[PDB]
Amino acid sequence: HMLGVRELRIAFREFDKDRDGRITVAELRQAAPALLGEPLEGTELDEMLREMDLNGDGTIDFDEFVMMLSTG
């Protein structure tokens, strides 16, 4: 059955509007506002983004998104 990637999927796949497997600051900004009806901030994003990356590329990959959440 599902070991736990379920949540990991629902989140990545959520902010992803192409199921391509990549949530660029763009997708995160198109999915982060709904979390609060309003876009928290701008530098607040790029900041968290820089922290959600493991290669500093500016994009989220399941391998990147997971490695982070998988342990947080």
Question: Residues annotated in the binding site for Ca(2+), as ranges?
Answer: 16, 18, 20, 22, 27, 53, 55, 57, 59, 64
Per DSSP, the three-state class of 59 is strand
User: At closest approach, how far in Å is the CB of 55 from Ca ion?
Assistant: 5
**C-alpha–C-alpha distance, residues 53 and 58, integer Å:** 7
**C-alpha–C-alpha distance, residues 55 and 30, integer Å:** 23
Single residue of 53, 62, 68, 69 touching Ca ion by CB under 5 A:
53
Q: Which stretch binds Ca ion (CB under 5 A): 1-9, 12-20, 33-41, 42-50?
A: 12-20
Residue count of the chain: 72
**C-alpha–C-alpha distance, residues 47 and 44, integer Å:** 5
- Binding interface with Ca ion (CB under 5 A): 16, 18, 20, 22, 53, 55, 57, 59, 64
